RNA sequence: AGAAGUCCAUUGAACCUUAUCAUUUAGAGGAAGGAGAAGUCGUAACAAGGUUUCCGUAGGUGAACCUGCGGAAGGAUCAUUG
RNA sequence: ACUCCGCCGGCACCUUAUGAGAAAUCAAAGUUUUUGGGUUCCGGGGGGAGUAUGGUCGCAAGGCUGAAACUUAAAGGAA
RNA sequence: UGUUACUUUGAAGAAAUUAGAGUGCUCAAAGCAAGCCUACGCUCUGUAUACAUUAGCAUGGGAUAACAUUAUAGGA
RNA sequence: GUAGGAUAGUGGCCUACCAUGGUGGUGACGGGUGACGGAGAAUUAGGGUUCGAUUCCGGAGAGGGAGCCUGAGAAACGGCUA
RNA sequence: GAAACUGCGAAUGGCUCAUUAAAUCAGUUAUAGUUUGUUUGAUGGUUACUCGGAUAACCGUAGUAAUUCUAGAGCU
């Protein structure tokens, strides 16, 4: 299962040893999983609706909301636990040559289980408060390289 | 030719960085060696006048140029400078205090004397256009 | 710095307020209060600046020391009290009393109003929400705090306070087609008809207002003050009435004023 | 990994074939 | 002393930050609390940044603990901390800190349980309890601890934060999970 | 309620090593370049410059330079269907 | 095999300027103040000097990379 | 609902400085004043406006250009 | 990454445990600056070059470090401790 | 109404540019990631005809070469 650390890891406010049943209440209510959208027209992931992963840093399953900028970018390392680095390609215009230089910035976001991601993929993130010394971005969406 | 591409911009910025150095005024600038110079970037100095000397003009001039070793107060430097004027070396004393400019080119040597860039303005706090057009005396005797 | 800052270079103040840049080293530094530092005309200005009741700053001091100057009906003695758009200014002495609006060159114009109109000021909404006990209240941007509130009422309303009852006599819902006058930015004291609301997920939302003369100006949706339902304002306007002319037309009329006058 | 792999290519690889032998069926009934 | 502050880390790429200020007051931590379990209870008030309090527990022998099933929450008496997901060491130093695992007294529970289901573990009150024990259900593992007189609860406060040592009642598969984690 | 003092821990100045780096600086002697009207020895380059000159490389000689091998004309030949 | 006409490709040559150039000369070294097809390397007065130093390659000879202080009013190209 | 560059318009944008409107400090550099008539005052007196790379935000345009994509259609 | 501790609060900010990642010729890392940044200044056909310690804004410091009390606010120096 | 207790302020201002090269800083964001004396607005349940012990100024014994260095006693 998904208890692989040394301590019990469930989601905050949801009860799991209610006598009553969670059929008919709303999510993360009656031992039901916790689950929200995020807005701005994204859509929540079927694996995170339906998931039995914990995360407390997944936008729609966690305790982080979006704000701020939404940026996109390729997957250029998914090496990291639930974290991966996307590259932003971007011209830098030189003004006294009136010509354009080729730049790029890592960002390191936040990914959680319900995606699937590869180098090479393209990604949109949403920026998030602090997670890490680095993260402040936390995956929205992934479309696969090729398609 | 030169490169043209709307997306060379940085090659064209690197390219003009690495050329200016081949630029004799540019590299005289931004080497950091007018620092080891004895004014060291200054545009006057004081110092002390270690001997009277006189040099040999160069050809195919023939005078013997009326100059002083000079010692810079600030950093100990010997330098030459030259005495301008008729006499005037008359109104200079060894170990005396006497203010330096250039001669004029930025460091380069001018007219016929032999390596000598630097001339004297002031003797003992006076001027050596004052004394010799005798609006003012050097302070003794 | 290791607090607060407690001195406005004059060069720093709001060029609004029109001080002179050699007549010192310092502006007055507004008070803390119901109007941003930045979006304020504090009494010692509208006192010895725009009013010449005072000729110095301790002349102010002395004017408002015996009680004689009241803003939204109660007596300020505070020099820098911030008062802003909207703002009802009463010197019972003098018989007068001032609403501070924009003229259509952005800066604060003491309107002369009378007695029955200096009864009562706009306000608009900020926010609504349920408070200690679950009371609903509504708070303005001009720092008021209202409990039970009409539940018809939400953010960005405009309601009409009487300073008397200090009550909500009754509100404007914003919506296209009413007549609103633009608060901040390039397009401050411009008047015109709401025409359209453009939303932005998670940005700021745009307005388009169109004057009466046609021309028509966008903002943000921070900057706009619903004035009256309709066309109609429900405040008295200065002579311009929000119609801002370009420098041509302005020209020309200083033109014609010189050949009549 | 792999179990995950062999799924989504084997039940790709089927519905695939599927398709193919329903559109020949298809154009099969169309000639007439 | 103590600081928060990043300007002593390494930058993302690796490369050393040189130091262009001092510390600030704004940006400082403070000793750990480090909180045992003992009947002499000591709580020390700390004057926070606004003025604000904060209360740090150096020892606490009672907590207030939710049976959250039964909805019931009783203060008890915390007798032993058991497991500590996060250093084994604070375990045998008998440390308090939140998600700790501990052992409480069960009873005043079990005082609440009798006077509500009228079971060990006035007509118009028989009528009731009676009727409270058609839906009444208890775990077997919940059940068989009431005998030793012990319950196993997880901290939910932070003790050197707030000055109190309070959790809930362990059931449910996190009951399973962290007597798993015990059974050596 | 509580001082001195004491205990452990934390932050941590400061000093003292070895090591490294930076900048400046002395040095017997060796040795380079430049400047300095009118030094000694030759005459190598410029004319086919009196052995055509020059490049690479190698060896040699007071000195310029000389010689071997391959190359160039910037040669002193744009030319032999004779 | 030779003779005649033509096409593509190659080493060149000859005449010519409507071109270019400081000219010598060049059918490209032309289509450039009427300035822009693409791209690499590379120069910024003469010396000091392809020297010193550090690095790197080589068994060595040396190669590659490569300064400054200082000095000088010219050096140089074509005719 | 493939993603961008580019372009158009707009919003937001410290003042001071720069450009610039008005104004006879005697002129001027400046300053932000003043003007009108002769009453217990007036002109709601004036204290405009433009510019402000790049990046970001939002409308319109889709030529030029970049990337992505295509046939066992996982097609409409 | 997980769980805690600390903080006004986010965060390797710190601790325990776990994983092996993170940055780099689109110049990381290191070195130089007689380098505080900006608003701006000089000169400017256009493009540009150079400058910007200094009165406006932001930051930083109070002989060098470190530590701290009071307080809403200071790691304060015309406060304290070393 | 001196003095003294209490309250508040002294974290602004002024000065300087040493350290500092994605750092400061600039434009642009976010706090649903926090604290905020004061101002302003609102809001605070269905011996008591008023408690207790201190201390300053003052007063008077002083110590030290000495400091807005300092001890003891009597008051309120
Ligand atoms: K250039
Ligand atoms: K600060
Ligand atoms: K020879
Ligand atoms: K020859
Ligand atoms: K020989
Ligand atoms: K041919
Ligand atoms: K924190
Ligand atoms: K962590
Ligand atoms: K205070
Ligand atoms: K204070
Ligand atoms: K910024
Ligand atoms: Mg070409
Ligand atoms: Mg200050
Ligand atoms: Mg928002
Ligand atoms: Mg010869
Ligand atoms: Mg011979
Ligand atoms: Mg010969
Ligand atoms: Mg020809
Ligand atoms: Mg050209
Ligand atoms: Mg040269
Ligand atoms: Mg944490
Ligand atoms: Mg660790
Ligand atoms: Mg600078
Ligand atoms: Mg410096
Ligand atoms: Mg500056
Ligand atoms: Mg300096
Ligand atoms: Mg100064
Ligand atoms: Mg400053
Ligand atoms: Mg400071
Ligand atoms: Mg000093
Ligand atoms: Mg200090
Ligand atoms: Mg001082
Ligand atoms: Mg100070
Ligand atoms: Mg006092
Ligand atoms: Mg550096
Ligand atoms: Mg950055």
């Keep these: 299962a998904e208890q692989t650390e040394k301590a019990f890891l469930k989601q905050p406010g949801v009860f799991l040893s209610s006598k009553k049943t969670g059929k008919g209440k709303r999510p993360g209510k009656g031992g039901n999983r916790y689950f929200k959208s995020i807005g701005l027209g994204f859509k929540t992931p079927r694996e995170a609706t339906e998931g039995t992963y914990i995360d407390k840093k997944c936008p729609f399953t966690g305790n982080v909301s979006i704000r701020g900028r939404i940026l996109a970018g390729t997957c250029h390392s998914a090496k990291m636990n639930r974290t991966i680095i996307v590259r932003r390609n971007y011209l830098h215009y030189v003004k006294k040559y009136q010509r354009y230089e080729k730049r790029h910035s890592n960002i390191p976001a936040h990914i959680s289980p319900c995606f699937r991601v590869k180098e090479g993929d393209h990604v949109t993130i949403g920026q998030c408060r602090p997670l890490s010394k680095t993260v402040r971005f936390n995956v929205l969406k992934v479309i696969p390289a090729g398609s | 030719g030169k490169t043209r591409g709307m997306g060379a911009g940085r090659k064209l910025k690197s390219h003009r960085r690495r050329q200016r150095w081949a630029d004799k005024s540019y590299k005289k600038s931004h080497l950091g060696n007018e620092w080891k110079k004895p004014f060291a970037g200054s545009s006057h100095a004081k110092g002390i006048v270690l001997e009277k000397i006189g040099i040999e003009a160069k050809q195919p001039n023939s005078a013997i140029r009326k100059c002083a070793r000079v010692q810079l107060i600030k950093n100990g430097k010997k330098i030459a400078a030259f005495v301008p004027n008729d006499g005037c070396l008359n109104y200079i004393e060894e170990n005396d205090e006497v203010l330096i400019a250039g001669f004029g080119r930025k460091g380069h040597a001018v007219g016929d004397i032999p390596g000598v860039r630097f001339k004297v303005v002031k003797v003992s706090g006076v001027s050596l256009l004052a004394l010799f057009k005798e609006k003012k005396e050097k302070p003794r005797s | 710095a290791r607090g607060l800052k407690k001195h406005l270079k004059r060069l720093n103040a709001p060029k609004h307020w029109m001080l002179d840049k050699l007549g010192g080293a310092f502006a007055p530094k507004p008070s803390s209060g119901p109007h941003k530092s930045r979006e304020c005309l504090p009494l010692v200005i509208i006192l010895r600046n725009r009013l010449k009741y005072a000729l110095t700053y301790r002349e102010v001091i002395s004017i408002l020391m015996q009680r004689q100057v009241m803003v939204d009906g109660k007596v300020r003695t505070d020099k820098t009290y911030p008062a802003g758009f909207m703002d009802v200014v009463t010197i019972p002495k003098t018989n007068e009393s001032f609403r501070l609006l924009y003229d259509t060159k952005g800066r604060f114009r003491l309107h002369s109003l009378r007695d029955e109109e200096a009864k009562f000021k706009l306000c608009k909404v900020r926010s609504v929400q349920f408070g200690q006990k679950g009371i609903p209240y509504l708070n303005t941007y001009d720092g008021r705090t209202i409990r039970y509130p009409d539940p018809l009422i939400k953010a960005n309303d405009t309601i009409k306070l009487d300073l008397d009852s200090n009550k909500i006599v009754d509100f404007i819902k914003f919506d296209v087609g009413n007549v609103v006058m633009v608060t901040g930015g390039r397009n401050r004291g411009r008047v015109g008809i709401l025409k359209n609301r453009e939303k932005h997920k998670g940005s700021f939302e745009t307005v388009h207002i169109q004057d009466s003369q046609g021309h028509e100006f966008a903002t943000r949706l921070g900057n706009v003050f619903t004035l009256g339902k309709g066309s109609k304002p429900w405040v008295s306007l200065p002579k311009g009435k929000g119609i801002k002319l370009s420098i041509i037309e302005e020209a020309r009329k200083r033109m014609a004023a010189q050949s009549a006058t | 990994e792999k179990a995950r792999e062999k799924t989504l290519s084997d039940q790709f690889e089927a519905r695939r074939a599927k398709n193919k032998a329903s559109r020949e069926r298809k154009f099969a009934r169309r000639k007439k | ?184």
């Design chain 5, 1 to 184: 002393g103590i600081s928060r502050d990043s300007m002593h880390k390494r930058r993302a790429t690796g490369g050393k930050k040189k130091s262009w200020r001092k510390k600030r007051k704004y940006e400082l931590g403070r000793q750990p609390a480090n909180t045992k379990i003992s009947s002499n209870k000591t709580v020390r008030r700390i004057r926070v940044r606004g003025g604000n309090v904060k209360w740090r527990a150096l020892r606490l022998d009672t907590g207030n603990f939710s049976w959250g099933s039964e909805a019931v929450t009783r203060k008890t008496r915390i007798l032993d901390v058991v497991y500590n997901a996060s250093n084994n060491e604070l375990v045998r130093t008998q440390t308090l800190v939140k998600s700790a695992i501990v052992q409480v007294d069960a009873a005043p529970f079990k005082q609440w349980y009798l006077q509500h289901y009228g079971i060990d573990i006035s007509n118009h009150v028989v009528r009731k309890i009676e009727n409270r024990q058609a839906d009444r259900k208890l775990d077997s593992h919940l059940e068989e601890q009431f005998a030793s007189g012990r319950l196993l609860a997880c901290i939910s406060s932070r003790p050197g934060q707030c000055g109190r040592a309070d959790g809930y009642i362990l059931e449910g598969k996190e009951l399973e999970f962290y007597m798993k984690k015990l059974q050596k």
